[PDB]
Amino acid sequence: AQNPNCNIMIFHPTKEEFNDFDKYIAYMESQGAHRAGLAKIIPPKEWKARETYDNISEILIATPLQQVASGRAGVFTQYHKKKKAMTVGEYRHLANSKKYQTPPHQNFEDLERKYWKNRIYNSPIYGADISGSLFDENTKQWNLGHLGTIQDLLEKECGVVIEGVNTPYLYFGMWKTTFAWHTEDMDLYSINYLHLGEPKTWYVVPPEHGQRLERLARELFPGSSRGCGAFLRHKVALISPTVLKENGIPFNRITQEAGEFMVTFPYGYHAGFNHGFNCAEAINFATPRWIDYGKMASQCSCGEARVTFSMDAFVRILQPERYDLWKRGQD
Numbered sequence: 001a002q003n004p005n006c007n008i009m010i011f012h013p014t015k016e017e018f019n020d021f022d023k024y025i026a027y028m029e030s031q032g033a034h035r036a037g038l039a040k041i042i043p044p045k046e047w048k049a050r051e052t053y054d055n056i057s058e059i060l061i062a063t064p065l066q067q068v069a070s071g072r073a074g075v076f077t078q079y080h081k082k083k084k085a086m087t088v089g090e091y092r093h094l095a096n097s098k099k100y101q102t103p104p105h106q107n108f109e110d111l112e113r114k115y116w117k118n119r120i121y122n123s124p125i126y127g128a129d130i131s132g133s134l135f136d137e138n139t140k141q142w143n144l145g146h147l148g149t150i151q152d153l154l155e156k157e158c159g160v161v162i163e164g165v166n167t168p169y170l171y172f173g174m175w176k177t178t179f180a181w182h183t184e185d186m187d188l189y190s191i192n193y194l195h196l197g198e199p200k201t202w203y204v205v206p207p208e209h210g211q212r213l214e215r216l217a218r219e220l221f222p223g224s225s226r227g228c229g230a231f232l233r234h235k236v237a238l239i240s241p242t243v244l245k246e247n248g249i250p251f252n253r254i255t256q257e258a259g260e261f262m263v264t265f266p267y268g269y270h271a272g273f274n275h276g277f278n279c280a281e282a283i284n285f286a287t288p289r290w291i292d293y294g295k296m297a298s299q300c301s302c303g304e305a306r307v308t309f310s311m312d313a314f315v316r317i318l319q320p321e322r323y324d325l326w327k328r329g330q331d
């Protein structure tokens with residue numbers, strides 16, 4: 001078995017190997033990359049996502065989210081308070097202000113220490129989940145707006161044509177902006193490209209050990225657990241590496257820098273934080289290997305998780321027993 005310790009693997013494809021996306025994902029899996037839940041892909045030196053980032057300031061962040069924490073430094077939840085619209089140029093200036101900017105630090109480890117010590121005492125503002133793309137239309141390789149769709153994968157594998165679409169999303173971050181512990185909708189893959197700015201630190205639990213994280217989460221968030229049998233779908237709970245280590249949960253960490261891709265694999269729980277002003281683009285995708293994970297994915301039916309139009313068909317076809325109850329949650 002390849003990668004039996006479930007380490008995060010880092011790949012350096014050549015420009016030739018960067019042509020065929022599906023083939024390269026299958027290659028990484030042949031080497032055991034999925035066992036980690038997360039892999040890094042450094043693009044060939046010849047590749048670029050677009051020519052420059054000099055003209056992005058007028059993108060609108062219609063609903064910036066203030067991430068307010070509750071709990072203790074290592075075990076907390078966050079809620080998202082909606083703020084007034086602002087442009088990316090306005091948001092960059094805010095991220096660089098004295099109130100929100102990255103503090104002085106020695107290295108990524110010192111910054112990580114500061115994040116876990118101090119996150120709860122601040123409420124950073126995240127421009128998340130913005131439909132759109134920063135890839136130039138002429139970028140042919142690993143263009144996250146030109147991937148094969150999940151609906152087409154399901155049709156190819158299973159023969160059933162379904163409604164729905166699959167487009168990318170932009171994320172504008174600042175120091176301390178946080179992504180809570182989660183797997184993807186329907187335990188899909190994700191791919192995330194850090195277009196510009198400061199790094200993003202990731203934490204990940206191997207898919208084979210995801211239920212250990214779930215059991216810890218039920219213990220740490222006991223009211224949320226009684227409220228919903230899949231409350232990590234709400235995407236609000238944070239647990240620090242120190243707490244994970246104290247409770248014996250297998251996990252790994254890595255820092256993504258600008259110009260790098262990350263892939264999350266089906267049922268790979270992940271969480272993390274941004275180091276400073278940045279912009280990422282991410283989208284879900286599927287492969288043949290996903291179908292079995294899609295069939296077994298948990299679902300939130302309490303009503304909190306509320307997701308896209310396109311998830312309907314995935315539930316309806318892959319999980320017809322759950323359909324009814326999950327749709328009640330969605331309406």
Ligand SMILES: O=C(O)CNC(=O)C(=O)O
Pocket residue numbers: 171178179190191192200264270280282283
């Ligand atoms: O970058 C973020 O805030 C969160 N991204 C992801 O969870 C992802 O790409 O799967």
Ligand SMILES: [Mg+2]
Pocket residue numbers: 055056057058059
């Ligand atoms: Mg612009």
Ligand code: NI
Pocket residue numbers: 182183184190264270
């Ligand atoms: Ni994710």
Ligand SMILES: [Zn+2]
Pocket residue numbers: 227228229230231233234300301302303304305
């Ligand atoms: Zn729920």
